[PDB]
Design a protein around this ligand. Sequence first.
Ligand SMILES: CCCCCCCCCCCCCCCCCC(=O)OC[C@H](COP(=O)(O)OCCN)OC(=O)CCCCCCCCCCCCCCCCC
Lengths: 52, 344, 47, 63, 120, 140, 459, 99, 27, 52, 39, 97
Amino acid sequence: PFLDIQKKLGISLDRHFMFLSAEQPYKNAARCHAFEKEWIECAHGIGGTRAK
Amino acid sequence: MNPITLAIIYFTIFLGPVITMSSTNLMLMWVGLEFSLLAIIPMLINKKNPRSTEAATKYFVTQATASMIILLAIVLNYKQLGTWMFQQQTNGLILNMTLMALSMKLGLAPFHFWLPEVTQGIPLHMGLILLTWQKIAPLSILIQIYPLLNSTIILMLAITSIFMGAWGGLNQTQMRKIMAYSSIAHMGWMLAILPYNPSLTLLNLMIYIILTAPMFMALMLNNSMTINSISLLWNKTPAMLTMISLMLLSLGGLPPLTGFLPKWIIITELMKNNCLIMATLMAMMALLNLFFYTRLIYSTSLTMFPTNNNSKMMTHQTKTKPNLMFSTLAIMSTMTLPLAPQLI
Amino acid sequence: FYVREPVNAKPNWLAVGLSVGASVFMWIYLIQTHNEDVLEYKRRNGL
Amino acid sequence: DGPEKNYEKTLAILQIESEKAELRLKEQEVRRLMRARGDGPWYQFPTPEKEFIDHSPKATPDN
Amino acid sequence: MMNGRPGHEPLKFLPDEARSLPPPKLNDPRLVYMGLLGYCTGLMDNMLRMRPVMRAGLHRQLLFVTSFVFAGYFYLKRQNYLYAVKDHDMFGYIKLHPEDFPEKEKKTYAEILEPFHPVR
Amino acid sequence: VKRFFESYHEVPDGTQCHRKTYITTALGGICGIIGSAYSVSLNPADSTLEAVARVGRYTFTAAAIGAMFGLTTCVSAQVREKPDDPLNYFIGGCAGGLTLGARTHSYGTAAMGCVYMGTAAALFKIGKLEGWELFPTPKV
Amino acid sequence: MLKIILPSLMLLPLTWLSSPKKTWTNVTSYSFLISLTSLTLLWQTDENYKNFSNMFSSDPLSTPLIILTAWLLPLMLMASQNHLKKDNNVLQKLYISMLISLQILLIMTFSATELIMFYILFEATLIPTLIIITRWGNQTERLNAGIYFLFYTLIGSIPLLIALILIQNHVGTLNLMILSFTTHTLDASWSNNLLWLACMMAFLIKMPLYGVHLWLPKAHVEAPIAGSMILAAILLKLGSYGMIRISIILDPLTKYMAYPFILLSLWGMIMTSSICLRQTDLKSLIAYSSVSHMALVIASIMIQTPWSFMGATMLMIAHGLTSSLLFCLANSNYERIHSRTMIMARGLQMVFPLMATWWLMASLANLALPPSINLMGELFITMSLFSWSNFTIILMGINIIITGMYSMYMIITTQRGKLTNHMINLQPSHTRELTLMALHMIPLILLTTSPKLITGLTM
Amino acid sequence: QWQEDPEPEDENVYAKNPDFHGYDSDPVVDVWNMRAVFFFGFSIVLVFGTTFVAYVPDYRMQEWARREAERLVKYREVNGLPIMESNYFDPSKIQLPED
Amino acid sequence: ARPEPNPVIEGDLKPAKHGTRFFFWTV
Amino acid sequence: LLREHWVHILVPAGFVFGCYLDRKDDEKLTAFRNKSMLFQRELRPNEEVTWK
Amino acid sequence: ARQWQPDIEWAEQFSGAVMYPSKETAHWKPPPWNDVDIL
Amino acid sequence: MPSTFFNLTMAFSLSLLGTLMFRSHLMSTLLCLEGMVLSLFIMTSVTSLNSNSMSSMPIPITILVFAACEAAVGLALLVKVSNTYGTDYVQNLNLLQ
Ligand SMILES: CCCCCCCCCCCCCCCCCC(=O)OC[C@H](COP(=O)(O)OCCN)OC(=O)CCCCCCCCCCCCCCCCC
């Protein structure tokens, strides 16, 4: 984000749980996990202006 | 303050903006905003004077409702996109809420009423923190989300702030409130270029911080909350009269000094983006800000106001010095203009 | 002299040595960085 | 030193200023294109990272 | 803007790629300015604290002129990189997307007919 | 409920003054309400009625400036036969300036108002004529 | 051109470092030589402009001024050694430095290739000037005068800032050289008709036009002599220099967008000239004389005929020197008299024989006596104005008759008639006062011998 | 009334220092502040400057053009060419719009 | 199908062209 | 040379520095050294620079 | 004759909680210097 | 939730209209302020629960923990006010004019 002290430090205290397809406890898959993946592996390397 | 408490609070007032900036999960950005709200309130009432309790109770209610509105935006997003963070798809109303809310915490435009009043009842010191280390947090959240916010609203809040700040300042004679009003104005320029070139917002802020921090440590060197009080500067400490003169004209946009660059490049970027309507009106009333800056100049430097005999007594005693920061932040601010290209 | 002996009557000799010594460490690192830098630049590019 | 020096100096000053001018304008066109196109390194706004998508075998069978 | 670029170093000051660029000459007018900017800070301090302006803190004067300058070389070293990235980025695009930036043709002034507005 | 205001611009100026005046009157009135609202929220009144009156005063005054602007500009255009002429608007802007002046019972304000308001309206005409863009999207 | 500038900057170190007793002579003696280095720019052996380097250039129009800007700093520092000799030894070194920065900034502004370099330096000159007027101004009203001088220039300035950034986007560089050799032809739209006004208005304000000239009478009245010399000799001409270099672009519109100003100026020339006829404050009369003789210039930088332009260049340099001379002698009367009133102090020639000769020559320069560059200037603007419309001679003909009347009235009621009975006895003339004058007129005599140097870009 | 000084009188510097030159009160500074001002002012600026300015050669080429005319007028007249032909940029170079 | 990744600007840095091209800064 | 004979060398020195700084600019703007059309000549014998 | 330095009256205006005093605004009084009130 | 998330949202707006228009006692605002936190807590919990997004349940509570302290600060200011003015009435808070 504004100051990426997280990527730099390598820590991931805030990224592991931002989307519904993130690791859910006991691997109880969320709902719409069939899609969000398909909608974020698509928009990866393609910026937003072209993820839209 | 039991020095331990001082540490916990100060850490929070400092962990508050830093969590906001570092995190991406908006939630964690919200609590960063929440911690800043909790940490600042104790310091605000340190004198515990009747004016102070009023200040904090206003600052807190204004800050709290805005915090709740920012949370609502995050809660709504969570249902329009499972993500905990604004995305291209975000409903426009969702973002506009965040603009209004964040423009309340930063105190821009039609929500500019709380700041002048809290800046009036808090000490000069806590005034600085309330003006400059508490603007970093919300602005971070906006700068991160710039690609998505509305160009129309920002501009309206921008222009309004410029006007309100300027007009408000003209009448004020209390210094704390003159600064509060200036901050509203500068904050306006900053939010004008956010949709177009966020990187310039971060310049129009730093320069504001490098200008305001010396200006306030100047006001408190003699702890003068009145212009009449700063006008007798010539007797209390004569040297700061020279730089106080340039820093205030620098705060307004006059060309040789560092203060022109933020306005100049913001105008260049807005004209590059074709807002030659908006940019023109902003620059024009920006000129109103210098009028009240120069009126203070008149009282403090260009003309010598009459002083009191008891002042001779304060001269005798050695004047506790101004920290080094004053100098390093007065010069880097009054004259860096020859080095603009690398700043931007 | 002074009824209340000035606190600055005799120099804080630490403040000299960390002020003087610090600056001389700055240069020796700065000048080093430049020539070192020039080199890498020169060799990184053809010359 | 002569008429030669200023004429040749002024032409060098014009070439630097002409070339600087063409580039400044091309920047404004490139920057218009990448903002809307989003097909260039500038103005590449972020989307979530696939490095967190959990591709593990989940409990239900339709993940 | 330039953030989001491929390879961006998430929190680094000046990526090693900036090694390829020439180092700022220590006497670059700018670094020399920073020096003077610094000396003045020093002198100003002495003044605000009511000390002999020039004959005092001759150690500090040095810290100042030498702190500002130190800062410069390493800042300018970066700002110089940032600008250099800007071209790498800009020039590249002009090519990768050539059609959008075609080399139009300019006619000699003979062919072109510019209207003549008499001054009279 | 917006396709409406826009209509003002669609038909050529100087034509269909009726619509023009109606639209202009509404905008002024809308501003009147908003203006009165801020004027009542802050600097409150003494009695509910007193404030209702304010609202009315501000609304009407604003509606009036709206009407005369619309009427004068449309009529001037028609009479002067200049379908598109910034001056037409200036005549109208001045008119609004004067109205406002009257409702405030001040010749001086009318002076302030005639020039400033008119100039502003004229600039609107030019703006439309030259396709000036206000609050533009970022296109860098 | 960094010898006309770097050695100048170094003056500041000398005003500060030097002894309190010797500060005045080091500064005045050195800038006299700084003027001598400035004279080297006059060596142009071919018509091509001398582009010293990327940012710094000097063409026929700037060169005649850079030398005047360098020349007056010595004189300004010699005219303010009296008042400002009652100060604390750190107020002086501030005033001396302020005067030094004005020509450093003004030398650069007149010698600047990039138009926005002009703007930044252009509007910076207000800082040094406002301090000189407000900080040392004798009257209660200088706070007011300072406000008028800052706002009229500032409100004009921000439109120019928007306009120049606008042309950079439209053309792609604000470099005066290129802008000249590139096709920038405005298209007579309603908008362009505004651009033109945006660029010219800021220059038209500091070049007092009839509509916005109230700032100059108020400013010179309470301004100290050095500030009044700077405003009349170099500061007002900054507006003219700007109009010459900015109208290279906006070429088509001024053909028809100038009428408003031209008429404002020529009628303005008559009324400003006339109110000089009954104004009790001498500094007031010289200031309105300055407005009228500068109203002629905006009416030649707008007709835009070769002769106008160099008529303008001739008059601007000439009137600059003459006005100061008048403002400088006005001060000498003010310091002994202690009042600005013209009616008091009658008969001085009876008691100050020579100053009166300087007064007479200054007035003859003020009115157009013929073997003077002042007349050549007006004769030329008059010619072109006649070409624009034969009727112009009527209005430029009422001004000549009025200009003769007020110029001689200043001599007749200040330097002739019976002596004032017993004002504070008027101490004899210092040699500084007389030289400060001689230094103004000896150059006026020398320039009139070879007018070619100050003829402008056109010829 | 408030406290403040009474307006000071202005001294007749000509009462002491009857040789006052107008620059400074003490006499030696005055003498040395005119001996250096008349000198650097008049003696080596109005004199050396005018000498140098007078000797600037063929300023703006107007000494060159009164000869180039003379050989052009010499050449054009003897060879029978018009002294100032009426089009400068040759018509052949100019491709006029064909419409 | 996954959309194509934006192309990659390629080469090595060379000192910027004509320097910071900011208003009148020979730089 | 510092009994007030050093304050007299400040400005004279500024000229020198200026002259040096000035001739530097000449070195930079030396393209078209002799490549201009009106003034292009073959370096006469023993001359490596037409204008320095 | 000495530059007019501001007298007490010129100074007076800058006192008061608002520079340009309004109809009802003027009724106000400057804030307490100590930042503490008597109520 | 399609219309069950509109009731909660309007609840938050009705609570919004409340905190923004004061009347006498300050407590009623604070109290109102809390009405929003409940509505936000309920909505966050509701969607997290029907999205089966268990990774996010931490938030519904973090919201409450921060909101509780937020309110603690708010009440201490309130107690501070009816110690200086003997009432929580807002009108009293008009010294900074
Ligand atoms: C430069 C730009 C503007 C700068 C203004 C401030 C500059 C001050 C510092 C420098 C001052 C000196 C340098 C600038 C002026 C230079 C004047 C000069 O160089 O005179 C040249 C003259 C020789 O004449 P020449 O140049 O050959 O003429 C060309 C003929 N084809 O040389 C001489 O013969 C000198 C003769 C001296 C005696 C002259 C006697 C005749 C005087 C006639 C006066 C007529 C009445 C004047 C009335 C005035 C108003 C009352």
